[PDB]
Assembly symmetry: D2
Homo-oligomer: 431 residues x 4
């Protein structure tokens, strides 16, 4: 609980709480009774009593009894079914016989898991959508804010803050595409009985799965997937990529907050938001190892791999929604310090503009000749500890082709941004 | 090398060998010169000399010099560019000036990586396609081969071998869908220069990227992605799911090969193919942790995360193609032992048919009554160590509703398969 | 909470609960005030008021306020210090000035972490000690219980159950050695102030650390270790090995519980204990990836890596203590089914004794000759579907050297156990 | 091969090459024949022929045949034994019968693995020893070089470069202790035969293992450990900690190389060494997940887990030795830029000395009063954009207790280093 505030996101944590989990299991049991009554497998009468008794089962369920019983049964569904049955019995000893009719523990657990995933995906998707919108808007606001591009953590050539923001925006848009593309394949119901054959429903199996899926508004699958878990992993893999995208952003803005750089700051000096996001960017990759090992499952119901999913999947959702929430706060209240950006550009005293000077000279001199005059000027500028502009401006060959004013233009960071504006426009359009 | 034969797949290993990597880099340099000549940035003359000198550069390149130089430069592209330039020079000192014009090391390395991924994906996709076809065909051949379904490694209720095969087939089909769905987003070119601004190409940047993408037949992206790596991770994540699917299959067939079960065997008694596949199902999840940590990259070119990708991505492809190749061999030459399957069904002496007997009795007796007669019969059958059929057949209540012949039918494994045939038909149709 | 019962161990979970964590932080603050009063840095008077106010601070602390404040400060220590100070103030506005004198957040957090580790290690060590004792005792009880040894999951040659138990016992003993060997190096105090220089204590720093360590009965280190985390990883690495040892045991006993093998059973048929232990054996390796990435920490206090430890370390302890607790239950109430063991030995109808027959014949025949008679007999026995003893006993060359009674001895599983009894005695002695 | 130069270390890579592996296997076979001849199990004559034929077997072995055969057998030992036998046969058809007498594949593979580990550990230990020596020497050289301590990547209070170096030195010393402490437990021989019972050696088993261990100068274990793998994991876990220690150092020196900080540089501006070390600090944690999953092994010889070790263990050694080698180069030729260190200390214009000013005033004013005068001065200094010294020096209360010269002393970074010199001396002594 003390850490929930630091790393997770309140709504996604609630969706995965013990109380919500049991709520979703109740929902799965109700849909099952309804789907069966609707096709004749059980009397409409029983379904109605179950549907009504359910509305308050959550308040009548003993969570201490449930936890203790879980350790002995090996899963929550078994003791949960006992309790729900006893609850429906105290309302009609007869409807009680139809509670959990034909299902096995994993049907209810996997279905509640998919119901949880459906709801937490909606929240995560909306967070990504706001992050995208906000990054696009800031990219536009600062598309002309010049600053240094850094490679291997060393100043290299100028870029604009808007270009970093456009790069992040486009990454969020690819995440939005990934989320939409997996929904149909992944949000499906689970109902197959003990060995996934629906044997106790005899020849009514396919009819009942179809109506069960429909009641919950989930997809239906061709065959039971108690042992094939690609759908679970697939959902985790997309959350993993989203966490990696904001992890990269948090690495960048906290580096820009170093005392000696101070170009961008987290809204109100410690980078508290970066610390949480970077912790999630450490933890999610480790949880991915786990969710992938969980694919190796024995026959019709695994020993170990399936149990591990109950611990890893929720943690991945919670860290991702938590990391997205802190990233949004930062993208919205981000403080840009234009003076420090200008100052850090002056750090190498014009040496970073060397190649720009060389390109301006190439036409009137031949690239070989241009390269040679600039390299000798850099040596001189370093020996005299002067700005490269001061040295190049007193070189004869050069005065032959450029006035002082043309030289001042050649040395402006803005004059060497290549096609950065085309790239920013290109990402503003894919929107 | 000795292990390559055990875990990898020959063609995918070649695509990622030092020699192929340098080949793809050469290909990237040629496309760059051609795209530039085609839009005016460099003389068509130079492009033609480079394109021709390239055809044999691979044979002229010194790989020992290259490896030694790589350790000092920090990447292969830098010493590779020197060498290729020297090679083009000995053919025309003038065309040599245009080699690697405007690109930075990462453009050539990421582009060669995507070219490699394109080729290895084609091979992996074709392996999945054959695995799918073969699983569908075997599923049909054995849709009626009865055997025990096992949960928590304990016999539970009958299923058919064809149902396990249909479950695997449908998993392969979802993999085929995943592979097709990422191609457009992932197989794109990389050309952005030092800080991804294409500054040295000035206002010709967007025009050149477009023609470079086209020359290589790759997609073009809105902005440079030197630091945003979701496309790399995404490709690894799909390979990871495929390896998890065959890992699950290898766990199953090797369990079916245990001396005491002996229901299915690897083609010619050790499960050599399972050992390799299960090793890949251990290694790939670990490599996933690595590829996901690699998303956290500093600014415009990372220190560490990017270097790690060069080691992990190829290993994931190689283990996946290797695991697919051994799985295909097994799916094709799989030996089914129907007698052992029949025998293991007799293992509990009819106790696994208890619920089937109870369902047959429910109508003529009321489920409560049916449950009670069957439970007392199980106790008796265990006490007398007799087959449950022998005990139930001499119970009065029962003889009242069933002749010996109807009892023999109720006890046949085939009579309690629920909707397994509908599920097998459903997966044969999605095809 | 519902899952705590399934995977963790009650006492270790309490040591890592929010309430115990704050308790240990209080303990760290008290020791600090006492150590300082004892060397003159603060008045003995203040230390006494703090020590007394502390006895009930836990009941006066607002945990909701604390959680909310934590999300904003980035760690629990900061809001905790405010609260504890306010608590000491309402008892003496003057002693309150000396609360948390000279320490930084990480000193209190790392010290409370080591106090927690000290207490959970004592519990884990005692669990390993009982597992060791129990395995040694069972090894002795069944040192002569013959059963099949299995390689690549295939029957190979006879072993005894006692030999598997001795192998597990010796592994537990190496764990006991590992635990004892790291205590001195790992259970040390943390007190270094903001940048680990104890600057606000001026020239009293070393004197105060020495007395602080002593008050808590922890080791003292030569230099501050806010950024060097090998001690944390080292503790996790040993817990990781212990979880791997019981993971291996759970894989084995659940395989022995398969319906068709049924040689050993979990005490009261699903392997519920194996499912939990195997889930921990999936999760701990993934958490190890995380704890190892956490070593890469920036300068004097990291951004991300340190925060991640707060989530991973406790989970590793909790899963290990949980896995040990279920393993102990199984080692103590383990049900051995000697008849099934005897029966599975008869599974290949004497074929597994082929090499034993060959060794008995080698002396009177020459190994070449012995190998050739046995191989032809195996072919015949398989063709006639007879026990190998029936075939070999009617082979002339053979009757020439052995009576029927000597042949019956050569075919007893017990006669081909090599030095298994020496190995079991050897592990009973290292005890 | 091209990457070997970037990430690994030449000698450790050779120890794990195919050629060295087969060399060590030959060595294991020779020791086995010798140990057996020495106790009577095989004729001294055969042992001598094998020992002599071995001296050149490596040159006679067909590596292509070996690789092809390996993929079919499932391990290298099987086809290797065939070849070595054929080699010994062409020298004496009789000695050939005793090649690999009584051993199983895993005995030779695990023994060659431990022989490799023994040799690579010697190299890694020596690298750590040199890193330790060099760090201690540099710590001494710069114990007085003042620079900023940084927390959460923000300047905090002064420290000395020597203190960072002492912290690293002490971490290397704990690694030296860890390496020495595991040798006895981990460097042991493996000889147990098919199911670890040495059944084919009958009652000579224990005698032969003892002499086999002795011939190779390895420890002997109480029982066979084909399935218990804690010794392998333990070796990987220590290499993992070493890689994490230099990973932390590489993060620090590359941050100190940022253009705007420029306090320390890699010897000859890109941090090429940091890039490799940080890639190993990403990859090793992932490989740890794998080596830990490999503990879960089936019965007497696993399917999958054991095979995976052949790929992970060597990679961990190679990355660790590679990371150590680059770290040593940097520790030895490290360039310290004292002026930039001095300059970055002036970055906040005295604000970082605020607490030092407050401690100097506390005695003559009361901590409350001191805190209040300093906080108002910081506000003023920020409003006027002046150095805090300029503001505090014109505050009356203050002039009352300090002359200008005493104020200049209070503001020197060196005057607020707490017990850093005691810590540096403490680590120089543990040496």
């Amino acid at each position: 609980q003390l850490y929930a505030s630091l790393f997770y996101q309140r709504d996604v944590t609630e969706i995965f709480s013990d109380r919500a989990l049991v709520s979703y299991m109740v929902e799965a049991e109700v849909a099952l009774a309804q789907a069966q009554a609707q096709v004749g497998v059980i009397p409409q009468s029983a379904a109605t009593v179950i549907q009504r008794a359910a509305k308050t089962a959550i308040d009548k369920i003993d969570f201490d009894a449930l936890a203790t019983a879980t350790g002995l049964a090996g899963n929550i569904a078994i003791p949960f079914v006992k309790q729900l049955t006893a609850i429906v019995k105290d309302a009609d000893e007869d409807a009680a016989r139809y509670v959990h009719w034909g299902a096995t523990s994993q049907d209810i657990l996997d279905t509640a898991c998919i119901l949880q995933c459906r709801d937490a995906l909606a929240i995560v998707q909306n967070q990504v959508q706001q992050c995208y919108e906000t990054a696009l808007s800031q990219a536009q606001t600062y598309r002309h804010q010049v600053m240094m591009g850094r490679t291997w953590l060393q100043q290299a050539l100028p870029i604009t803050l808007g270009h970093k923001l456009a790069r992040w925006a486009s990454a969020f848009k690819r995440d939005l595409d990934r989320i939409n593309a997996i929904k149909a394949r992944v949000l499906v119901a689970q109902l197959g009985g003990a060995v996934g054959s629906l044997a106790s429903l005899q020849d009514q199996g396919s009819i009942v799965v179809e109506a069960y899926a429909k009641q919950l508004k989930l997809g239906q699958t061709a065959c039971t997937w108690h042992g094939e878990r690609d759908r679970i992993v697939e959902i985790a893999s997309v959350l993993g990529i989203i966490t990696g995208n904001v992890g990269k952003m948090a690495r960048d803005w906290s580096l820009m907050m170093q005392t000696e750089i101070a170009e961008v700051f987290e809204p109100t000096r410690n980078p508290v938001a970066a610390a949480s996001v970077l912790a999630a960017a450490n933890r999610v990759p480790a949880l991915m190892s786990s969710i992938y090992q969980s694919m190796v499952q024995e026959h019709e119901r695994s020993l170990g791999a399936w149990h591990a999913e109950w611990l890893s999947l929720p943690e991945i959702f919670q860290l991702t929604a938590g990391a997205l929430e802190r990233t949004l706060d930062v993208l919205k209240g981000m403080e840009v310090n234009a003076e420090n950006m200008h100052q850090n550009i002056e750090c190498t005293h014009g040496l970073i503009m060397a190649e720009a000077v060389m390109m301006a000279l190439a036409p009137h001199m031949g690239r070989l000749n241009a390269h040679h005059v600039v390299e000798a000027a850099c040596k001189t500028a370093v020996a005299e500890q002067k700005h490269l502009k001061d040295i190049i401006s007193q070189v004869d060959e050069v005065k032959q082709y450029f006035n002082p004013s043309q030289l001042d233009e050649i040395f402006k960071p803005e004059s060497y941004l290549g096609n950065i504006q085309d790239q920013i426009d290109a990402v503003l359009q894919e929107a």
